[PDB]
Design an enzyme around this catalytic site. Structure first.
Site, PDB file in Angstrom:
ATOM      1  N   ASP B  88       0.855  -1.172   0.000  1.00  0.00           N
ATOM      2  CA  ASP B  88       0.000   0.000   0.000  1.00  0.00           C
ATOM      3  C   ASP B  88       0.900   1.233   0.000  1.00  0.00           C
ATOM      4  OD1 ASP B  88      -2.273   1.491   0.002  1.00  0.00           O
ATOM      5  OD2 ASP B  88      -2.973   0.871   1.990  1.00  0.00           O
ATOM      6  N   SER B 185      -5.969   7.794   5.579  1.00  0.00           N
ATOM      7  CA  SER B 185      -5.124   6.933   4.746  1.00  0.00           C
ATOM      8  C   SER B 185      -4.171   7.714   3.848  1.00  0.00           C
ATOM      9  CB  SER B 185      -5.987   6.021   3.864  1.00  0.00           C
ATOM     10  OG  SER B 185      -6.745   5.113   4.639  1.00  0.00           O
ATOM     11  N   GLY B 186      -2.987   7.152   3.608  1.00  0.00           N
ATOM     12  CA  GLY B 186      -2.003   7.817   2.770  1.00  0.00           C
ATOM     13  C   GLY B 186      -1.239   8.869   3.559  1.00  0.00           C
TER      14      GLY B 186
HETATM   15  O1  LIG Z   1     -14.793   0.131   6.150  1.00  0.00           O
HETATM   16  C1  LIG Z   1     -13.869   0.392   5.367  1.00  0.00           C
HETATM   17  C2  LIG Z   1     -12.415  -0.221   5.694  1.00  0.00           C
HETATM   18  C3  LIG Z   1     -11.522   0.952   6.198  1.00  0.00           C
HETATM   19  N1  LIG Z   1     -12.014   1.489   7.504  1.00  0.00           N
HETATM   20  S1  LIG Z   1     -11.566   3.100   7.923  1.00  0.00           S
HETATM   21  O2  LIG Z   1     -12.405   3.553   9.148  1.00  0.00           O
HETATM   22  O3  LIG Z   1     -11.918   3.985   6.714  1.00  0.00           O
HETATM   23  C4  LIG Z   1      -9.860   3.189   8.271  1.00  0.00           C
HETATM   24  C5  LIG Z   1      -8.878   3.390   7.179  1.00  0.00           C
HETATM   25  C6  LIG Z   1      -7.474   3.464   7.420  1.00  0.00           C
HETATM   26  C7  LIG Z   1      -6.951   3.338   8.790  1.00  0.00           C
HETATM   27  C8  LIG Z   1      -5.531   3.405   9.098  1.00  0.00           C
HETATM   28  C9  LIG Z   1      -5.052   3.282  10.449  1.00  0.00           C
HETATM   29 CL1  LIG Z   1      -3.558   3.419  10.743  1.00  0.00          CL
HETATM   30  C10 LIG Z   1      -6.013   3.083  11.550  1.00  0.00           C
HETATM   31  C11 LIG Z   1      -7.422   3.006  11.313  1.00  0.00           C
HETATM   32  C12 LIG Z   1      -7.949   3.129   9.943  1.00  0.00           C
HETATM   33  C13 LIG Z   1      -9.375   3.062   9.632  1.00  0.00           C
HETATM   34  C14 LIG Z   1     -12.161   0.473   8.595  1.00  0.00           C
HETATM   35  C15 LIG Z   1     -12.448  -1.019   8.178  1.00  0.00           C
HETATM   36  O4  LIG Z   1     -12.556  -1.857   9.071  1.00  0.00           O
HETATM   37  N2  LIG Z   1     -12.554  -1.315   6.755  1.00  0.00           N
HETATM   38  C16 LIG Z   1     -12.803  -2.737   6.312  1.00  0.00           C
HETATM   39  C17 LIG Z   1     -11.581  -3.676   5.994  1.00  0.00           C
HETATM   40  C18 LIG Z   1     -11.674  -4.259   4.541  1.00  0.00           C
HETATM   41  C19 LIG Z   1     -10.494  -5.216   4.142  1.00  0.00           C
HETATM   42  N3  LIG Z   1      -9.134  -5.098   4.884  1.00  0.00           N
HETATM   43  C20 LIG Z   1      -8.011  -6.077   4.614  1.00  0.00           C
HETATM   44  C21 LIG Z   1      -6.702  -5.986   5.309  1.00  0.00           C
HETATM   45  C22 LIG Z   1      -5.671  -6.944   5.012  1.00  0.00           C
HETATM   46  N4  LIG Z   1      -5.842  -7.965   4.095  1.00  0.00           N
HETATM   47  C23 LIG Z   1      -7.048  -8.083   3.426  1.00  0.00           C
HETATM   48  C24 LIG Z   1      -8.150  -7.185   3.639  1.00  0.00           C
HETATM   49  C25 LIG Z   1      -8.955  -3.950   5.910  1.00  0.00           C
HETATM   50  C26 LIG Z   1     -10.165  -3.012   6.218  1.00  0.00           C
HETATM   51  N5  LIG Z   1     -14.074   1.225   4.210  1.00  0.00           N
HETATM   52  C27 LIG Z   1     -15.455   1.803   3.938  1.00  0.00           C
HETATM   53  C28 LIG Z   1     -15.388   3.362   3.753  1.00  0.00           C
HETATM   54  O5  LIG Z   1     -14.423   3.767   2.722  1.00  0.00           O
HETATM   55  C29 LIG Z   1     -13.080   3.216   2.959  1.00  0.00           C
HETATM   56  C30 LIG Z   1     -13.067   1.658   3.146  1.00  0.00           C
END
Ligand SMILES: O=C([C@H]1CN(S(=O)(=O)c2ccc3cc(Cl)ccc3c2)CC(=O)N1CC1CCN(c2ccncc2)CC1)N1CCOCC1
Ligand SMILES: [Ca+2]
Lengths: 51, 235
Positions: B88, B185-186
């Site tokens: 990332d 993010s970023g």
């Molecule tokens: O719900 C999400 C994502 C991000 N968010 S977030 O609130 O914005 C978010 C984004 C970046 C962050 C960076 C740090 Cl350091 C700390 C907290 C953070 C919270 C939380 C989440 O649980 N998720 C769900 C998850 C979906 C899949 N993931 C992985 C990780 C490893 N390998 C495979 C899959 C991680 C996040 N969305 C919907 C809204 O638009 C953005 C994306």
């Protein structure tokens, strides 16, 4: 030597040469005359808060 | 940023904000030089056409010291995939040079070994951004900073529902209601050393925001240094 002691007493990057430490700085800085401190070259050296 | 303090004048001079056509801040960035911005690859999916903004601390009041920049070329890491969130990282080449002034200055790029040995072995680091102040709240209107502890690599995995790869690292708290959040993010994760700041990580992901037993997951900047340099020469 012993960049582990207190970062070899450098301001930034510390390296070891089998027996002694070799300090160096980030881009935009020049190693001071004591071969330890780093000195800026512009009014906006990287990593400094513009307070 | 959930919790933490506000970025006071001159404190977070390397913060960069990616904005969509609606001038909405949707992601963060770290100023690496007058020409380059460091961001997360997955941030180039949360928008279509976007520009990077610097010198901003309050998204609603023209402080005068702000400035907008267009993107000439965006360098995404090929190996990046959304199903793992691995690699990332992305670099942005600005069309015009960033003029450094108050609130607008670059963060240093450390060296791999010294960094892993001294920067990340430190007690804490700093993360910042205009992201949400709660998991369900709205995008912050003021730029914020937060001292986040480095998290033991084991616990990190033990607490993660997903595989924490070699290119990631945990930072933050277990129960304490402080951590980054959506929109951050970023953004930059920097480590302080003798009053000089070095980039150490990119805000990548997390499961929710500031959840108990969950940590913030950052991109390990030290693991792409040579890559970052290859990008500075545009490649
Ligand atoms: O719900 C999400 C994502 C991000 N968010 S977030 O609130 O914005 C978010 C984004 C970046 C962050 C960076 C740090 Cl350091 C700390 C907290 C953070 C919270 C939380 C989440 O649980 N998720 C769900 C998850 C979906 C899949 N993931 C992985 C990780 C490893 N390998 C495979 C899959 C991680 C996040 N969305 C919907 C809204 O638009 C953005 C994306
Ligand atoms: Ca403003």
């Amino acid at each position: 030597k012993l960049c582990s002691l207190d970062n070899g007493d450098c301001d930034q990057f510390c390296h070891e040469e089998q027996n002694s430490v070799v300090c160096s700085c980030a881009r935009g800085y020049t190693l001071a005359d004591n071969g330890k401190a780093c000195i800026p070259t512009g009014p906006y050296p990287c990593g400094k808060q513009t307070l | 940023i959930v919790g933490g303090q506000e970025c006071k004048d001159g404190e977070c001079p390397w913060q960069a904000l990616l904005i969509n056509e609606e001038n909405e801040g949707f992601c963060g960035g770290t100023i690496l030089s007058e020409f380059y911005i460091l961001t997360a690859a997955h941030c180039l999916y949360q928008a279509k056409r976007f520009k990077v903004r610097v010198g901003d601390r309050n998204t609603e009041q023209e402080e005068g010291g702000e400035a907008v920049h267009e993107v000439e070329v965006v360098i995404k890491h090929n190996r990046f995939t959304k199903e793992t969130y691995d690699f990332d990282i992305a670099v942005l080449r600005l069309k015009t040079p960033i003029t450094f002034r108050m609130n607008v200055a670059p963060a240093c790029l450390p060296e791999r070994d010294w960094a892993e040995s001294t920067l990340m072995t430190q007690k804490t680091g700093i993360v910042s951004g205009f992201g949400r102040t709660h998991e369900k709240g709205r995008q912050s209107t003021r730029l914020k900073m937060l001292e986040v502890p480095y998290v033991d690599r084991n616990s990190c995995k033990l607490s993660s529902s997903f595989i924490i790869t070699q290119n990631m690292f945990c930072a933050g708290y277990d129960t304490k209601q402080e951590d980054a959040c959506q929109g951050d993010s970023g953004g930059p994760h920097v480590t302080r050393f003798k009053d000089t700041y070095f980039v150490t990580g990119i805000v990548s992901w997390g499961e929710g925001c500031a959840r108990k037993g969950k940590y913030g997951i950052y991109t390990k900047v030290t693991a792409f240094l040579k890559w970052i340099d290859r990008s500075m020469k545009t490649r």
